[PDB]
Amino acid sequence: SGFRKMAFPSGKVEGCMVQVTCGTTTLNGLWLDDVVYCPRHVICTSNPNYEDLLIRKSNHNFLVQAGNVQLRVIGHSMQNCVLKLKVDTANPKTPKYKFVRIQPGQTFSVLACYNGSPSGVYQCAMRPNFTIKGSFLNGSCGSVGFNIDYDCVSFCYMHHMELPTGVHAGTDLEGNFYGPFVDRQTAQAAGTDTTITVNVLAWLYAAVINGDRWFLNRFTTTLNDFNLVAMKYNYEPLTQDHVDILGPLSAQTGIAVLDMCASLKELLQNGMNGRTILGSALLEDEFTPFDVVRQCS
Amino acid sequence: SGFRKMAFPSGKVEGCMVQVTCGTTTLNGLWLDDVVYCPRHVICTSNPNYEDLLIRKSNHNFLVQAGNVQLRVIGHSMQNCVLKLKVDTANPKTPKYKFVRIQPGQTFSVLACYNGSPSGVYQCAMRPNFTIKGSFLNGSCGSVGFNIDYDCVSFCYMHHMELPTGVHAGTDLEGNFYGPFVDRQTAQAAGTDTTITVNVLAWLYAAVINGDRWFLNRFTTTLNDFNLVAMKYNYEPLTQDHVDILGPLSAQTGIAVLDMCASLKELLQNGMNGRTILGSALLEDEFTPFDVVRQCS
Ligand SMILES: Cc1cc(CN(CCC2CCCCC2)C(=O)NC2CC2)no1
Numbered sequence: 078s079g080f081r082k083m084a085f086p087s088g089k090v091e092g093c094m095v096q097v098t099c100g101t102t103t104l105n106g107l108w109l110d111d112v113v114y115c116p117r118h119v120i121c122t123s124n125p126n127y128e129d130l131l132i133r134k135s136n137h138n139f140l141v142q143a144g145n146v147q148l149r150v151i152g153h154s155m156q157n158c159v160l161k162l163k164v165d166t167a168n169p170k171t172p173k174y175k176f177v178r179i180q181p182g183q184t185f186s187v188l189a190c191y192n193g194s195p196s197g198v199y200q201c202a203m204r205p206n207f208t209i210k211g212s213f214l215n216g217s218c219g220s221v222g223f224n225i226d227y228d229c230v231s232f233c234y235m236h237h238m239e240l241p242t243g244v245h246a247g248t249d250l251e252g253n254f255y256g257p258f259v260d261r262q263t264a265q266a267a268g269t270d271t272t273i274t275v276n277v278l279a280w281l282y283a284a285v286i287n288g289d290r291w292f293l294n295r296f297t298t299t300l301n302d303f304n305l306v307a308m309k310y311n312y313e314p315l316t317q318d319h320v321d322i323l324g325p326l327s328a329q330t331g332i333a334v335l336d337m338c339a340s341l342k343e344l345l346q347n348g349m350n351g352r353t354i355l356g357s358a359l360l361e362d363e364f365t366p367f368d369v370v371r372q373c374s
Numbered sequence: 375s376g377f378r379k380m381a382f383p384s385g386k387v388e389g390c391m392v393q394v395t396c397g398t399t400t401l402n403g404l405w406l407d408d409v410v411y412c413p414r415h416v417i418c419t420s421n422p423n424y425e426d427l428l429i430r431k432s433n434h435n436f437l438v439q440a441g442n443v444q445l446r447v448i449g450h451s452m453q454n455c456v457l458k459l460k461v462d463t464a465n466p467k468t469p470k471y472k473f474v475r476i477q478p479g480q481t482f483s484v485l486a487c488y489n490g491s492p493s494g495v496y497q498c499a500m501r502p503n504f505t506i507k508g509s510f511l512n513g514s515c516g517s518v519g520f521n522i523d524y525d526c527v528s529f530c531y532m533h534h535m536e537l538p539t540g541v542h543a544g545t546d547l548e549g550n551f552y553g554p555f556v557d558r559q560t561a562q563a564a565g566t567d568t569t570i571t572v573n574v575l576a577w578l579y580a581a582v583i584n585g586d587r588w589f590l591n592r593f594t595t596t597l598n599d600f601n602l603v604a605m606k607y608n609y610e611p612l613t614q615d616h617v618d619i620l621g622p623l624s625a626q627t628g629i630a631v632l633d634m635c636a637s638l639k640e641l642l643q644n645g646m647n648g649r650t651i652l653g654s655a656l657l658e659d660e661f662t663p664f665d666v667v668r669q670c671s
């Protein structure tokens with residue numbers, strides 16, 4: 078029993094983290110085979126044209142360090158908002174990996190790093206507004222996000238920056254931003270966010286599997302009538318695909334999805350009346366159906 | 375910015391996890407140098423005298439597997455509630471390590487494992503009643519808890535079992551239980567718990583560092599007057615050592631500890647009035663002062 082925000086074991090990613098320095102800027106890179114991937118921000122100096130900044134660089138300007146071992150840069154290129162530094166040494170710790178872009182509402186593990194040294198690991202969801210609610214300080218740029226499936230690391234996030242509300246923005250490993258953001262100082266701000274309805278329902282199923290039942294009721298609702306309440310409370314609409322994805326959790330608990338939707342309607346309209354669900358006094362939306370199945374009985 | 379429940383990177387511990395099987399019981403062991411540490415439960419079969427059960431075993435009865443590599447057991451001994459299996463091979467991935475026992479109110483990272491394969495990583499506090507609120511299923515026995523300081527792994531917890539309230543119990547790596555528990559099925563239950571006051575104050579300092587200030591007030595309280603309110607709300611007493619430990623966070627924020635105690639008194643007496651602190655609608659007590667400093671600006 079028990080239900081925790083649980084990260085993937087980080088070892089396969091730790092073996093890939095390196096330090097990249099250009100002039101007086103140090104940040105993190107990801108060393109896979111003979112390439113180091115890092116944010117192109119590393120080449121900026123006190124609205125940059127990055128194509129011009131990169132043409133002015135030489136391989137020898139990039140100081141790449143894997144622990145105590147300097148990696149010699151033998152080529153450099155720009156891919157969107159990331160740099161590809163070709164090095165003289167293939168990483169012998171390269172795991173099986175893929176570069177995948179994730180959807181809003183999906184979760185991943187963040188390996189927070191500084192100076193190429195991993196600091197901590199935690200779970201993040203990609204918000205509907207394409208930000209993440211992480212924990213990052215100066216020097217964290219180039220920290221990565223990932224999921225692991227059968228020892229294959231699916232890298233989905235490279236950290237770039239903090240927005241003014243204290244939420245975080247970054248790119249896929251192809252260097253394409255999540256969301257309407259750019260890798261420079263502008264007045265850019267997080268768009269309005271919404272609650273990830275399918276994830277709240279997954280977490281209510283986790284709560285039932287773990288013996289929290291107080292919020293259940295004999296009532297069912299329609300999908301249309303549920304979606305009217307969702308809109309009112311700034312919840313995402315629930316689709317039949319969402320209902321289908323919640324199939325296994327519904328089967329395991331014997332609680333129909335639209336019966337659980339009647340519970341969530343009552344929680345939105347009434348609150349909890351001083352009660353808690355899985356240790357929370359709020360409705361939690363950063364667990365996917367897969368996160369619940371991965372972890373729960 | 376941001377404040378997350380953050381685990382230590384788990385790689386140094388992943389390289390130590392192995393599978394131990396005796397008869398039809400499989401669980402996890404910890405391989406350091408030429409010894410595998412595991413719960414003595416592995417030798418039980420359908421009130422066991424473990425000294426008798428162990429005298430009846432041979433080295434060849436223990437099947438130890440490190441990934442795909444069988445480790446030959448060349449000696450066995452019992453230390454309290456753990457077994458020490460001497461193997462023919464020193465673990466080449468053994469980190470610098472210590473076996474430390476932790477105090478109630480301290481935190482650690484759990485590497486949840488199954489069949490010797492790491493599954494997930496998350497933070498736990500040792501509760502005042504010597505339980506942890508983890509996430510463990512059958513097969514998790516022998517999963518370990520640890521802190522990392524400058525690449526030295528301080529192992530503090532080996533998982534044994536779930537209690538009837540769905541909280542978890544285990545031992546230090548010397549095999550001594552945390553709390554008044556035993557490694558067999560009895561009617562044993564978690565004792566009454568309390569809230570870790572010094573950790574709630576640390577987390578309110580984290581909240582101020584991260585820009586949540588709504589709960590601050592111009593008032594100060596005495597330590598005695600604070601401790602009268604603490605007792606009423608089932609909070610641990612606050613000691614002058616606690617006030618001293620909160621020194622650095624007080625200095626960083628310019629908020630005196632007894633001024634923050636006046637804020638916590640108001641939160642206990644009045645609640646939050648529908649507001650949140652660091653994304654929580656409850657007072658969080660599973661961050662130590664060190665966890666806040668480790669992570670925050
Ligand atoms: C807080 C906080 C910091 C960070 C990451 N940053 C900021 C980098 C951005 C600055 C604005 C323009 C785009 C890149 C760094 O690690 N910066 C160090 C390497 C130089 N994230 O949250």
Ligand SMILES: Cc1cc(CN(CCC2CCCCC2)C(=O)NC2CC2)no1
Nearest residue numbers: 078510511512513514515535536557558
């Ligand atoms: C839920 C849950 C399970 C567990 C861990 N257990 C239970 C072991 C205890 C059983 C009672 C007596 C003392 C040992 C196991 O992993 N058991 C598998 C290896 C056989 N923790 O939470």
